[PDB]
Amino acid sequence: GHMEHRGTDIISLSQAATKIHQAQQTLQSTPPISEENNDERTLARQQLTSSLNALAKSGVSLSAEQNENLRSAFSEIWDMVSQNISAIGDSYLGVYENVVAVYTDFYQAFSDILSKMGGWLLPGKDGNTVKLDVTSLKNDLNSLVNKYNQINSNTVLFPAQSGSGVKVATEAEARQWLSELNLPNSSLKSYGSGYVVTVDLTPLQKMVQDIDGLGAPGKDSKLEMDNAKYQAWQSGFKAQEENMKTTLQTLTQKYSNANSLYDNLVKVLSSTISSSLETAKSFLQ
Ligand code: NI
C-alpha cells in the first residue's frame, strides 16, 4: 500500500479524460434529428461508460472529498457512477433523442404541406373575394393525419423503436412519459400487450374541422370566399400551426435540458479526473 505509481495514474486518468471529452463533444455538437445522429450519440455514451469501466479497474485513488462529490452527484465508487450515468443516458436522454428525431420528421411533413398553400389560393371573381382550394388542402391534411395516426417508428415517441417489434410499455410507464412530455391525453395509445406515446394530431384535426366549417365547395372543388372570411379562416389556421410549433418547441427544450442534465454529470466526471491528475503531478515540498 506504500508503493506509489504516479506514472500509471497519469496514463489512466488522461485516457479517461480524453474519452470523456470526446463523448461530451459529440453530445454537445450532434443534434438528435435523425436515426443516424442518434446512433452516433448512443455510441458516444457507450464510449463514455466503457471509459469509466476501465478507470474503475485502474487503481487511481480518490480523496474523501472526490468520493463525496461522486456519491452526492450520482445517487466500487466508479462502478456505481457508471451504472447511474448509463441509466440516465438510456432511460431518459435516449428517450428524448427519440422524441426529437420522430417529431422532427413529422413536423417536416407538415411544413411540406404548408409549402403548397400558395398554390391553393387563387383570384376570386373580383378584388373583394378569393378562391381557396379547400378540397386539395383538406385531402393533404387528412393524408398526414392517416399516416401519423398509425403505430410504427414514424409515429412512436416512447418507447424508442428498433428491429422487428413494436416495443411497448406498461400503461403506468407510458402515462409518466405522457406527463413528462406535456402531451394531450390522445397521444397515449394502446398497442397489443401495452402502451405507446405518439405525436399530437389534434391541431391538424382542428384545421380539417375549421375547413369543413367554411361550407361546401362549389363544382370545381374550391370555395369562393369574401376577403374578410378568408382572413378570419387564415388567422384560425395560423393559430393551429402555432399550436404544433409550441408542442415541438416544448419537446426540443425538454430534450436540451435532459442533455444538459447528462452534461452536468459529465462535468462532474471531468473535474474529478482533473483534480486526480493534479494530485498525480504534484509534489508536496
Ligand atoms: Ni505497500
Curated annotation (Swiss-Prot):
Record's subcellular location: Secreted
Coiled coil spans: 238-265
Keywords: Coiled coil, Secreted, Virulence
GO terms under cellular component: extracellular region
Superkingdom field: Bacteria
Pfam families: T3SS_TC (PF06511)
Family, per entry: Belongs to the invasin protein D family.
Domain writeup: The N-terminal domain is an intra-molecular chaperone that prevents premature oligomerization of the residues on the coiled-coil region that are involved in interactions with the needle and/or itself. The residues in the C-terminal domain probably form oligomeric structures at the tip of the needle that are responsible for the regulation of secretion of other effectors.
Biological function: Required for translocation of effector proteins via the type III secretion system SPI-1, which is essential for an efficient bacterial internalization. Probably acts by modulating the secretion of SipA, SipB, and SipC.
Name listed for the protein in its UniProt record: Cell invasion protein SipD
Species classification: Bacteria, Pseudomonadati, Pseudomonadota, Gammaproteobacteria, Enterobacterales
Gene for this chain: sipD
